[PDB]
Nucleic acid binder design. Structure first.
Lengths: 134, 50, 155, 77
RNA sequence: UAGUGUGAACGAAAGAUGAAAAGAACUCUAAAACAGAGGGUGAAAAGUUCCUGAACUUGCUUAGGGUUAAGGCUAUUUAUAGUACCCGUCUUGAAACACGGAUUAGGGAGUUUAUCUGUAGUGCGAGUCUUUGCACGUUAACUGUAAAGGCGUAGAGAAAGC
RNA sequence: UAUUACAGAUCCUAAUUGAAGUAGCGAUUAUCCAGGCUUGUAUCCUGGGGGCUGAUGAGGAGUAGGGUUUCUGGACAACUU
RNA sequence: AAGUCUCUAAGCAAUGGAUGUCUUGGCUCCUCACACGAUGAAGAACGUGGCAUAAUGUGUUAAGUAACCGGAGUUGCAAAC
């Protein structure tokens, strides 16, 4: 149960804030877990997704393919990918949007800000697990 | 008309360049449908009263 | 579109339909009743209706219509020559019989008219006559939608 | 008599566009009925509290005034 | 906002495809961006003010009734016998030549506050109420509590006095 | 616990019947024939008859008012009984 | 003693938008604030985007520019970075 009064627990208010958030919060809302090869390497589960890296979806028509992110979309709230294409009735491939929380990140590409984010969360996760005592 | 003033002529200009169909690309962008241009009219039917 | 059937096969039956054709309903229904006649010979009836040698009998929608001689063959005396309806039933039956190359195992020459079903459709068009004392009455009939099926007399 | 025939000679304009209001400025009397120009104070009455809030602040852009609301959010939050 | 009025002013209607546009290629009849028919997309046409799709009205098909305006009720061997005036309303009296009522859907009218009355339920009882407020809190609640105050405990009289 | 049960209020809003393919399609000189363009014209254009308006003219032009109605090209879902 | 007419019922449709399910909108109560303007306010008009009429930004530095703070494409097509 929440103690902080200034955050609201009504469903109307949360959806309105969520869909009409600022740009910086929407990038954080668009995020996914790493594959276990990258979890041991970088020392984090969860990261926000960019146009550099590639991703791998379990369960679907497009089941179990890797492919790079062509475009993130924050208003439409979904991710376009290479490979993930059905053709039209016309002979024309069209990329098909998928929400990142269904998806695992298989490779990652560094940025000064991405390295600076990772070194924070590594040091944060070392403190919290020592506190809880696992 | 003729013998219109200039600030009368300014209003009659703005009243005719505003009179047009809505562009096609807004329906493609926003995906909304069934938006009409409000300041469309016909000269014979509705008078301006300006 | 949808269609409606009774002892008719889907595979063997040549179809045609419209929606929103700007023609009166009551004469379109009345022609359609008469049509249920081989299609090729049913057109020869409707071309005689165009030039006014043979009439269409009005049983249901007859109020104010005067009597005529070309009624005699049908029985009904109230019987007139709706030309604009006869144009459509020609140009629907002709388009239905262009399922010769589609839908094989049905001969085109010896086809019966199985089914007709007219009804009233959505009013796309609106107009009004202005009349005395600033009163503005309507002046626009409701447009139709029509639904033919043709089949050999095996169903 | 008093209807259709006497509507014929209606070509003069009683009211003209008003500078402050921009809307009903009386040419002979020279006053904007809606806003009261040119009286320096702008016309509103408490019996037309409905019609006033169509004209009054909020309706327009508020270019200077919206940024002075936005300061007072930051200082108290 | 659309829109009305010379003007002060006045002021509507209108939400929902699908998980994702995958928003319907190409062919045939046709003068043809008329209108269909094949063929496809999708889990399902749900096919563009497209979820569900009621009633009134209409079309087609199937089955019966019909000189008795139609409908209802009772009885059976199911087309007969007997019976049956149109509801709502003010009225001594309505089938009335009294008024309201063309059809259908959705809205649509004894509620709440203060000061009291009486009956019943509940707690305490010569007492009772804890509220203005203070202290608490998992915080508008709940819980704890000091002292006043309300009504009751004595009345009659215009009043003095009793 | 309540914005809690409808057939009526010349009730409110929304849609829809019969009447009805009926009443009616007025006022304004008058149309006819052959060609052109077209899926398609008495109507759009050409040519030729027959007519009308008959200098306070449905002629040529302006105030007030309207505000692009002017002009050329393409178009006919609607409107111009 | 005729019926394609009229009356009643059922099934499949047309018309119409009720019911049911949804909800980035209201309504109220409580909290905090009021520091608009001759340094040109509130209000009005017109400009301005590659395809932009309304509204929203914004004023020939006109969907913006500079600095500081965020820190990687906030949407259809086209183009650039």
């Amino acid at each position: 149960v929440k103690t902080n009064p200034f955050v609201s627990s009504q469903a109307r208010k949360v959806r309105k804030s969520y869909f009409n958030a600022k740009k910086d919060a929407k990038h954080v809302a668009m995020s996914a877990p790493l594959s276990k090869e990258l979890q041991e390497a970088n020392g984090i589960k969860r990261l926000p997704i960019r146009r550099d890296d590639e991703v791998m979806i379990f369960s679907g028509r497009m089941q179990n393919r890797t492919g790079k992110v062509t475009a993130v979309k924050l208003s439409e709230m979904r991710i376009y990918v290479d490979t993930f294409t059905t053709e039209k009735i016309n002979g024309q491939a069209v990329s098909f949007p998928v929400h990142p929380s269904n998806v695992v990140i298989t490779k990652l590409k560094m940025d000064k800000a991405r390295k600076n984010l990772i070194e924070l969360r590594r040091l944060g996760r070392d403190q919290i697990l020592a506190k809880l005592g696992h | 008309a003729a013998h219109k003033t200039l600030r009368t002529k300014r209003i009659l200009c703005k009243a005719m360049k505003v009179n047009r169909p809505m562009p096609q690309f807004i329906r493609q962008m926003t995906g909304v449908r069934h938006i009409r241009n409000p300041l469309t009219r016909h000269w014979r039917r509705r008078k301006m009263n300006i | 579109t949808h269609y409606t059937f009774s002892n008719v096969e889907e595979s063997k039956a040549l179809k045609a339909s419209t929606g929103l054709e700007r023609v009166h309903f009551k004469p379109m229904m009345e022609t359609g009743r008469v049509i249920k006649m081989k299609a090729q010979d049913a057109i020869a009836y409707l071309e005689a209706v165009m030039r006014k040698e043979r009439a269409v009998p009005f049983f249901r929608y007859k109020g104010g219509i005067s009597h005529h001689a070309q009624g005699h063959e049908w029985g009904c005396p109230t019987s007139r020559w709706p030309v604009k309806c006869a144009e459509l039933y020609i140009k629907l039956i002709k388009t239905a019989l262009a399922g010769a190359p589609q839908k094989p195992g049905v001969n085109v020459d010896e086809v019966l008219v199985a089914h007709v079903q007219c009804n009233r459709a959505t009013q796309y068009r609106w107009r009004r006559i202005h009349q005395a004392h600033g009163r503005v009455k309507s002046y626009a009939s409701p447009p139709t939608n029509v639904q033919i099926v043709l089949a050999e007399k095996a169903a | 008599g008093a209807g259709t025939p006497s509507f014929g000679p209606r070509h003069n304009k009683t009211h003209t566009i008003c500078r402050r209001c921009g809307n009903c400025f009386h040419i002979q009397k020279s006053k904007c009925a809606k806003c009261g120009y040119p009286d320096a104070t702008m016309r509103h009455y408490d019996w037309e509290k409905k019609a006033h809030r169509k004209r009054a602040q909020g309706s327009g852009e508020m270019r200077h005034l919206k940024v002075t609301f936005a300061k007072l959010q930051r200082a108290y939050a």
